[PDB]
Design a protein around this ligand. Structure first.
Ligand SMILES: [K+]
Ligand SMILES: [K+]
Ligand SMILES: [K+]
Ligand SMILES: [K+]
Ligand SMILES: [K+]
Ligand SMILES: [K+]
Ligand SMILES: [K+]
Ligand SMILES: [K+]
Ligand SMILES: [K+]
Ligand SMILES: [Mg+2]
Ligand SMILES: [Mg+2]
Ligand SMILES: [Mg+2]
Ligand SMILES: [Mg+2]
Ligand SMILES: [Mg+2]
Ligand SMILES: [Mg+2]
Ligand SMILES: [Mg+2]
Ligand SMILES: [Mg+2]
Ligand SMILES: [Mg+2]
Ligand SMILES: [Mg+2]
Ligand code: NA
Ligand code: NA
Lengths: 92, 135, 33, 218, 52, 85, 103, 89
RNA sequence: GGAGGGUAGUUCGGGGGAGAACGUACUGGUGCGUCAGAGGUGAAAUUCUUAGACCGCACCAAGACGAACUACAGCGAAGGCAUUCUUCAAGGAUACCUUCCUCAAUCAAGAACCAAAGUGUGGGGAUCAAAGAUGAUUAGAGACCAUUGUAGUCCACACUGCAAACCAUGACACCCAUGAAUUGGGGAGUGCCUCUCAG
């Protein structure tokens, strides 16, 4: 996937947070550049994240895989429901 | 008089189905739709030998009988449809196919639009005999 | 936890109804003109 | 037999010869009305006989009886075929045979299935022995033909679509537009089936037949 | 009448208002064969193989 | 036809047909060329085969189209071959 | 002793593994498609004597319109091709003539 | 296979009931006590609780499944058919 | 002019896995028509038939199979692979002034796949048809021929691991005379030509 290559580039040369609690903190502080949401996210939690992104003028990407796939893409051995990129060091 | 109100010079068309297998021959006259059979004479109605039912002679006798009976109903011409056994079968016409057609022409009928209508599968079931065939 | 779920559910779902009602009305007016 | 009565079969008005057959049926006795026995029959005629030295001598058209008007049976198009010995005459070895099946709908609400056949051609300059085609070009020919047929038939009533099929107007359009893809030869419409019909508008049948010739029966 | 032909169904009513009488045991279902808009009747295939 | 051919110094006729890597000494088949798009004042160096995508530096327009084999230039532009070395 | 170099079929090594079998035209025995003997037959529906009589009685074929023919592709097992004299045993050194086309 | 060569979980039955009835019941016994993947939360946490009832330890969801396995092959075919027929309108 | 990886023609092909449809045919039903035989053989007889068989036309259901085109043609490690459309992941050849720098060849032990028949559990059951039953032929006929007929033949999931599983020819590398053909990629006069088209 082309998004997987961009994600791998961010992990190499960027800053990010994994998880709902840390991502929402970045949105409140206005330091987030892009938010990636997995296909597993429950409907009520996804709607809350999209509202924060609308207020912050933050683009949203909808991942095709579930949280198990999103964690694997980031090289982790756990699940990540949502990911927030605070620094697009090289990618776009 | 029974058949049709038309001039004597006019042509009234029927359809004759000729089924010439290797064991019998059928001569079957209908109208332009397949319903409403007019005559049906087979080669086994004209012999007694049980092995000459497919002969050219038995086919000729059946064709002459049909022409005589249909000549009163005002039928002057016929379209021709010929067939062999077909689907899983010989696919080649039997001995009485030519005799029946020629006998119709000589007896005085008119012919038009001959055509062969053998049933042909575009992929079939298995045929009789083993994989070694008939021995 | 369950009180927070109801409050968020009440506010967010009502917002979607307001947004989609406006979109339907505006599209009808735009189409008619 | 003594119970039979004779009738006449009439084709629609987009045909030169209107009365092309005669038939028999039983007298109406008791609960048998003899018009219920006639309202579903299929009659076949030769296109060369109906329409007047072309390919038409090898084409057959079927008509289905819809109404009984006195001693005339009024009919509508039901199908079309090509006769088996004509197809075998166009087949050759060392060529690719291209076949297509198309589903189309007219404006009245008729559903049609059309079967096409075409063969590759060798060109006058050629010295090789094959004339075969790449499967990418075969797939392209099939789709371009499908689009042309569907778009042309989608804005026509049944009578105009039938005139298109039996007068070789669509055939020439397909041959001209498919030649640039691959050389091709002998493109034909092999068979047409009517797989769906509308709900018997009686006013439609009147307009299709126009002026009905009389009969001299009974 | 609003279910497309060839669809798998369960809890079918045999009479309007019966609240479900056919295909109620484990792993069972019915198949919709055809509709008849002239008479308003639907044909099904029952788990036992019969048609109703 | 009376000429005697040796393997150390092959004639021009027989060498021009050989596959690369089948010559006496293998070598490339490709070259470079200066391509001038209509206008834009700029000159770009383009590979003959150039499977990748190529955009002019100024107008940000594609110059060549990939192809199994040699690349094909867009209709307007005309090229000019460069010397081997 | 290898009688033939192609072993009686048209399947070189390193080309195929299996060819689908067909039924013999006559005995209905299953034979691979490349091994069988195949002929394309075009035969008239009526001979010369009968065609003259039928043409005279008809208005369609009465003036220079061809009568229909029968087209069939026949495939034979080896035994039924020999018995029906479609092919014959040939001398060694004559078994190599090929006859690429029907003439 | 240190404790038992081939009996597996059926080793609790001793030398009773026959080898082939035991083999047939072993396949359904293993999957009935296994942990199945949960699509709602992405965990292997689905466990059976009475025939046809499956509960996830992670998200605490209950699903109606099939007897001895979470999803039956007939169910997978049905979901695809219904999705295609819905998209057809 | 050893191996691996990359980019491109969205290249090439009955290569593989999933869906949705299509085509006639065999068998069985339904509705009309007709009236005395039909089937089968070297010749017949078991079979069907005025309680309407066989034949003709129009439909319906179900299971299998994709004719002709089809070849000293293509694809696959072998076994194998043939209707169309939509999809999923692969594989080879070619092109390259791309990358890397011996990563290789062949093999006891070990592993995976493997026509048909056969086995287990669920489906399905049109055709053909081991066992079996009738009729013939024969000195006899348990056989060949005829009418039937169960398991099988088809699908899913587990087994089995054998073929004239053959090119009766183990794998890798080098040299080696000619002339016509053929399949795929690349380089350098003629016909069609309003978009899977600078084709
Ligand atoms: K046998
Ligand atoms: K055999
Ligand atoms: K041969
Ligand atoms: K490569
Ligand atoms: K009857
Ligand atoms: K298939
Ligand atoms: K038998
Ligand atoms: K062996
Ligand atoms: K090739
Ligand atoms: Mg055998
Ligand atoms: Mg060629
Ligand atoms: Mg090969
Ligand atoms: Mg083999
Ligand atoms: Mg039938
Ligand atoms: Mg085919
Ligand atoms: Mg088997
Ligand atoms: Mg079995
Ligand atoms: Mg079974
Ligand atoms: Mg049988
Ligand atoms: Na062999
Ligand atoms: Na061996």
């Amino acid at each position: 996937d082309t998004i997987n290559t961009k994600i791998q580039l961010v992990m190499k040369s960027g800053k990010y947070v994994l998880g709902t609690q840390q991502s929402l903190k970045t949105l409140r502080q206005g330091r987030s550049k892009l938010v990636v949401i997995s296909a597993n996210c429950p409907p009520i939690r996804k709607a809350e994240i999209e509202y924060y992104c609308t207020l912050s003028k933050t683009p949203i990407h909808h991942y095709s895989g579930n949280n198990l796939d999103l964690g694997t893409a980031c090289g982790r051995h756990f699940r990540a429901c949502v990911l927030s990129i605070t620094d697009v060091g090289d990618s776009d | 008089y029974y058949g049709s109100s038309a001039g004597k010079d006019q042509l009234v068309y029927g359809v004759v189905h000729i089924y010439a297998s290797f064991n019998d021959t059928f001569v079957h006259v209908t109208d332009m739709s397949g319903r409403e059979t007019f005559c049906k004479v087979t080669g086994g109605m004209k012999v007694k030998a049980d092995r000459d039912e497919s002969s050219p002679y038995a086919a000729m006798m059946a064709a002459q009988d049909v022409v005589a009976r249909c000549k009163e109903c005002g039928i002057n011409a016929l379209h021709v449809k010929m067939r062999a056994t077909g689907g899983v079968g010989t696919k080649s016409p039997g001995p009485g196919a030519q005799a029946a057609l020629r006998a119709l022409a000589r007896a005085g009928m008119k012919i038009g639009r001959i055509e062969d209508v053998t049933p042909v599968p575009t992929d079939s079931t298995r045929r009789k005999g083993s994989r070694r065939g008939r021995r | 936890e369950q009180v927070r779920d109801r409050i968020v559910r009440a506010f967010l779902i009502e917002e979607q109804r307001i947004v989609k009602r406006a979109l339907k009305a505006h599209a009808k007016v735009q189409k008619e003109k | 037999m003594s119970r039979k009565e004779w009738y006449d079969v009439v084709a629609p008005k987009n045909f030169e010869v209107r009365q092309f057959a005669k038939t028999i049926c039983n007298k109406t006795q008791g609960t048998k009305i003899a018009a219920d026995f006639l309202r579903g029959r299929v009659y076949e005629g030769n296109l060369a006989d109906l329409n007047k030295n072309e390919d038409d001598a090898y084409r057959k058209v079927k008509f289905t009886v819809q109404e009984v008007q006195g001693r005339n049976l009024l009919t509508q198009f039901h199908g079309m075929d090509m006769t088996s010995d004509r197809v075998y005459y166009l087949l050759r070895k060392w060529c690719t045979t291209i076949e297509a099946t198309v589903e189309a709908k007219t404006a009245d609400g008729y559903g049609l299935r059309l079967f096409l056949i075409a063969f590759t051609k060798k060109q006058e300059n050629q010295l090789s022995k094959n004339c075969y085609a790449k499967t990418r070009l075969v797939k392209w020919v099939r789709m371009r033909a499908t689009n042309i047929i569907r778009r042309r038939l989608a804005k026509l009533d049944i009578n105009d679509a039938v005139s298109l099929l039996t007068r070789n107007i669509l055939r020439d359009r397909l041959a001209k537009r498919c030649n640039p893809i691959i050389p091709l030869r002998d493109l034909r419409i092999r068979k047409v089936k009517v797989i769906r019909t509308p709900k018997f508008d009686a006013q439609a049948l009147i307009a299709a037949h126009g002026e009905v010739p009389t009969s001299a029966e009974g | 009448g609003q279910i497309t032909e060839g669809c798998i169904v369960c809890n079918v009513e045999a009479k309007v208002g019966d609240r479900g009488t056919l295909a109620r045991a484990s792993g069972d279902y019915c198949i919709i064969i055809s509709h008849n808009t002239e008479t308003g009747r639907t044909r099904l295939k029952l788990p036992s193989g019969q048609k109703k | 036809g009376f000429f005697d051919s040796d393997l150390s110094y092959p004639t021009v006729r027989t060498e021009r047909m050989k596959h690369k890597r089948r010559r006496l000494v293998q070598g490339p088949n490709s070259y470079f060329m200066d391509v001038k798009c209509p206008g834009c004042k700029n000159i770009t160096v383009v590979y003959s085969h150039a499977t990748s995508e190529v955009k002019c530096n100024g107008c940000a327009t594609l110059l060549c189209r990939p192809t199994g084999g040699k690349a094909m230039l867009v209709t307007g532009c005309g090229f000019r071959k460069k010397p081997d070395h | 002793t290898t009688k033939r170099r192609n072993h009686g079929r048209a399947k070189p090594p390193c080309s195929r593994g299996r060819v689908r079998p067909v039924h013999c035209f006559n005995c209905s025995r299953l034979v691979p498609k490349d091994k069988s003997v195949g002929r394309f037959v075009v035969r008239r529906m009526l001979d010369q004597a009968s065609a003259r009589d039928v043409a005279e009685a008809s208005l369609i074929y009465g003036s220079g319109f061809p009568m229909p023919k029968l087209y069939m592709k026949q495939r034979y097992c080896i035994a039924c091709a020999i018995h029906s004299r479609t092919v014959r045993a040939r001398p060694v050194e004559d078994r190599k003539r090929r006859y690429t086309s029907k003439v | 296979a240190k404790r038992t060569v081939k009996m597996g979980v059926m080793g609790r039955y001793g030398a009773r009931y026959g080898s082939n009835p035991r083999k047939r019941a072993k396949k359904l016994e293993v999957s009935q006590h296994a942990k199945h993947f949960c699509s709602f939360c992405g965990k292997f946490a689905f466990r059976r609780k009475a025939v046809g009832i499956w509960r996830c330890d992670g998200c605490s969801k209950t699903v109606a499944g099939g007897a001895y396995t979470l999803s039956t092959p007939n169910n997978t075919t049905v979901r695809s058919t219904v999705r295609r027929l819905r998209e057809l309108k």
